[PDB]
Amino acid sequence: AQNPNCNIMIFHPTKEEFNDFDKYIAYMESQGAHRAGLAKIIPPKEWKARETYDNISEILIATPLQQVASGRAGVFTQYHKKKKAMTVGEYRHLANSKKYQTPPHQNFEDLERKYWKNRIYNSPIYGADISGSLFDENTKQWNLGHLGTIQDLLEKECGVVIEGVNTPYLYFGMWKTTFAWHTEDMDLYSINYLHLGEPKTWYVVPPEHGQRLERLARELFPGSSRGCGAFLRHKVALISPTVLKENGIPFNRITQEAGEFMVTFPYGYHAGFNHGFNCAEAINFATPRWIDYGKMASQCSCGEARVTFSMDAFVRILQPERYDLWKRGQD
Numbered sequence: 001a002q003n004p005n006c007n008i009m010i011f012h013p014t015k016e017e018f019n020d021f022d023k024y025i026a027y028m029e030s031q032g033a034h035r036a037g038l039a040k041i042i043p044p045k046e047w048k049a050r051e052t053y054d055n056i057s058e059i060l061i062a063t064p065l066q067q068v069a070s071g072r073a074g075v076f077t078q079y080h081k082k083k084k085a086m087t088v089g090e091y092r093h094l095a096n097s098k099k100y101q102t103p104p105h106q107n108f109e110d111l112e113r114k115y116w117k118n119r120i121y122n123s124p125i126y127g128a129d130i131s132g133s134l135f136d137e138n139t140k141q142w143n144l145g146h147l148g149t150i151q152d153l154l155e156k157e158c159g160v161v162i163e164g165v166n167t168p169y170l171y172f173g174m175w176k177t178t179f180a181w182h183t184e185d186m187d188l189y190s191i192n193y194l195h196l197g198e199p200k201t202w203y204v205v206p207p208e209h210g211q212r213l214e215r216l217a218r219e220l221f222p223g224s225s226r227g228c229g230a231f232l233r234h235k236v237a238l239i240s241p242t243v244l245k246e247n248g249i250p251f252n253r254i255t256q257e258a259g260e261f262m263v264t265f266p267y268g269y270h271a272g273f274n275h276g277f278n279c280a281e282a283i284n285f286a287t288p289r290w291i292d293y294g295k296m297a298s299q300c301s302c303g304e305a306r307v308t309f310s311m312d313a314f315v316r317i318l319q320p321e322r323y324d325l326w327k328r329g330q331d
């Protein structure tokens with residue numbers, strides 16, 4: 001078996017290899033990349049997402065989210081407080097202000113130490129889940145707004161035609177902005193391109209060990225666990241690498257820099273944080289190997305998850321027994 005230790009693999013496709021997206025994902029998996037839950041892909045030197053980022057300041061962040069923490073440094077939840085709208089130019093200025101800017105630090109490891117020591121004592125503001133794309137329409141390779149759709153994948157594999165669409169989201173981050181432990185909706189893949197700015201550090205649990213993370217989460221957030229059988233779907237729980245190590249949870253970490261893609265694989269739990277002002281674009285996608293994960297994906301029916309209507313059809317077709325109970329939570 002390839003990659004038996006479930007290490008995060010890093011790929012350097014040539015421009016020729018970068019033409020066929022599906023084929024390259026299949027290649028990565030042939031090398032065992034999916035066993036980690038996360039892979040990095042460094043694009044060919046000849047490739048670019050767009051010509052410049054000089055004209056993005058007028059994008060609106062309609063609902064910036066202030067991420068307020070509760071708990072202890074290594075085990076905490078965060079809730080999202082809605083703030084007034086601001087442009088990306090205004091957001092960048094805020095990110096760079098004395099209150100919110102990245103502190104002095106020696107290297108990525110030093111900054112990581114500071115993040116886990118001090119995160120809970122601040123409330124950074126995140127612009128998340130903004131529908132849109134920063135890929136140039138003329139970028140033909142790995143354009144996250146031009147991928148084959150999950151609906152078409154389901155149709156090709158299973159012969160079922162369903163409603164729904166599948167478009168990218170933009171994320172504007174600043175120092176300490178945080179993404180909680182989660183897998184994707186319906187345990188889909190995700191692909192994430194860091195367009196510009198400061199890095200993003202990722203933590204990931206191998207898919208074959210996801211239930212170990214779930215068991216620890218139930219122990220660490222016992223009230224949340226009693227409230228919902230899939231509360232990590234709420235995307236509010238953080239557990240530090242120190243606490244994961246103390247509890248023997250297998251995981252890896254890696255830092256993504258501007259110009260790099262990350263792919264998360266079905267049922268690969270991940271979490272992380274931004275180093276400073278940045279902008280990422282991400283979208284979910286599927287392959288034939290995903291279908292069995294979609295069938296088995298755990299759902300939040302307590303009603304806190306609140307997802308896109310695109311998910312209605314996935315649950316309806318792949319999880320018809322759960323559909324009635326799941327839709328009540330949505331409605």
Ligand SMILES: O=C(O)CNC(=O)C(=O)O
Nearest residue numbers: 171179190191192280282
């Ligand atoms: O970048 C973020 O804040 C979160 N991204 C993801 O969880 C992803 O791409 O799957």
Ligand code: NI
Nearest residue numbers: 183184190264
């Ligand atoms: Ni994700």
Ligand SMILES: [Zn+2]
Nearest residue numbers: 228300302304
């Ligand atoms: Zn729930």
